[PDB]
Structure formats: C-alpha cells, structure tokens
Amino acid sequence: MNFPQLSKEVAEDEAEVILHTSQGDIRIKLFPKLAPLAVENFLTHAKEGYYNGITFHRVIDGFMVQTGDPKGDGTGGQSIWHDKDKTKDKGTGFKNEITPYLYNIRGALAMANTGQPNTNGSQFFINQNSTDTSSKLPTSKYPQKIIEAYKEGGNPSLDGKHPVFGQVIGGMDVVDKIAKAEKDEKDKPTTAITIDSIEVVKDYDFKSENLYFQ
Ligand SMILES: [Cl-]
Ligand SMILES: [Cl-]
C-alpha cells in the first residue's frame, strides 16, 4: 500500500500550501483525493482570506497545536457550505472523511470538530507529539509502515475521530516552536501566534477529471 504522508514529495494528485505564521512558515501537502471535503473547505477558506489574522489559540507541547477559529477560543468557525448546501453541512459542519491511508502521525493536519458527527467547520490542528507509543498499536488495524511511522510520534487515539487531510513537509521546527510558546492556564499563547497569510503553491481544481499515472 502507498501511504502518501510518508513522502515529502508533492504527488501530481496532491495540493501544497504554506502557512505564513508570525513564528515562521509551515509547508503542508494536502490529500484532495482522500479527504475532498476537508481539502476544498480549507483551500477555499484560505483563498477567501478566512484564516488571515487567525491565531493558534491552543498549544500543548507533546500533543498538538490548534487554530482555524475566527473567535480565538475554540468555539467558532463554519464550513464553506454552512447555510448554502445541506447535502454537505446540515448546520454544525461537514462529515468526517476517515480513510485507512491517512493517520494522526506527527506532522498530520486534521480537522478538530466537537467529537460528534458532522461537526467539521474551519478549525484544524497539527499533530506535534514526538513520543514512540507504537508498541500499543493493534497490528490488525495499523499497517506495518504506519506503525513504523508512529515511532517518530503521533496521537493514534485521534484516528477515526479526526479526519486527516494534510501533512507538514517543511517547517515542523516552526510547529514545535509554536507548541512550546509561553501560554496561560487555558493553553493560549501569551503573545499571539498568527497566520498572516496562506500561500497556495499548488492548487487543486475539484472539477478536474484528469487521470494521473500512479
Ligand atoms: Cl513521516
Ligand atoms: Cl461525521
């Protein structure tokens, strides 16, 4: 099996963005063929300026950093289909796109949501854990190459609950710097860490029917 998170190369069927944050650049490749709703929602919000000035409002070293909330407290954000297309957003967000090809390994980009179905809106997080807990993973559920990948860290308890849609391929040192920022009792950084802009290096057209040789 091919696990697209295990290569830093951007495949022909992948997209690429750079989060230009006040702490540095995070280069991320996206998986529109595996998580089409999460990637379309993210790319459209990015190009529409929805994340310009948005903060990393909650950081936990050894766990993850989360962002994408216009309210800055983890209670806000909407999908691009909210009050536009009920076949995609019934009112609280879009559905989880879980696939056996994407996991919450270190560097994985996933949607936050409330833990209930159809609650993916605009909030997302980057897995930042760097501890090896791979010996506890059931070999009947985790492919051997993914168990190997988890040795570098990740949050496997998030698999199946949080849809993965991207992978950091550059600037993980910036993600670690953000995760260790000085913060208050609610884990909100003392000095705001902002997404100043998102550069779409390689976009993806959801109406494209091009076939790519694998
Ligand atoms: Cl990896
Ligand atoms: Cl769902």
Residue numbers in the entry: 60 to 273
Cite, word for word, the article reporting this structure.
Here, we solved the protein structures of two secreted parvulin and two secreted cyclophilin-like peptidyl-prolyl isomerase (PPIase) ATP-independent chaperones found in gram-positive streptococcal species. Two types of ATP-independent extracellular PPIases exist in pathogenic streptococci: the parvulin and cyclophilin families. Unlike cytoplasmic PPIases, extracellular PPIases have canonical secretion signal peptides that allow for their translocation across the cell membrane via the Sec pathway. These chaperones are lipidated to the outer leaflet of the membrane and function in the space between the bacterial membrane and cell wall.
In contrast, S. pneumoniae SlrA (SpnSlrA) is a functional PPIase and, like SpnPrsA, is also critical for the colonization of the upper airways as well as for invasive disease. We then solved the crystal structures of SlrA homologs from S. pneumoniae (SpnSlrA) and S. pyogenes (SpyPpiA) to 1.88 Å and 1.28 Å resolution, respectively, using single-wavelength anomalous diffraction (SAD) data from selenomethionine derivatized crystals. Models for two chains (A, D) contain all residues of the recombinant protein: an N-terminal methionine, residues 61–267 of SpnSlrA, and six residues of the fused C-terminal His-tag. To gain further insights into these novel structured appendages/insertions, we utilized AlphaFold3 (46) to model our solved SpnSlrA protein structure and a known tetrapeptide substrate (amino acids AAPF) of the human cyclophilin A. The predicted interaction revealed a model where the appendages interact with the AAPF substrate in a dynamic fashion, suggesting that these appendages may aid in substrate recognition or activity. Using affinity isothermal titration calorimetry (ITC), we determined that SpnSlrA and SpyPpiA bind to CsA with a dissociation constants (Kd) of 122.4 ± 41.4 nM and 365.7 ± 102.1 nM, respectively.
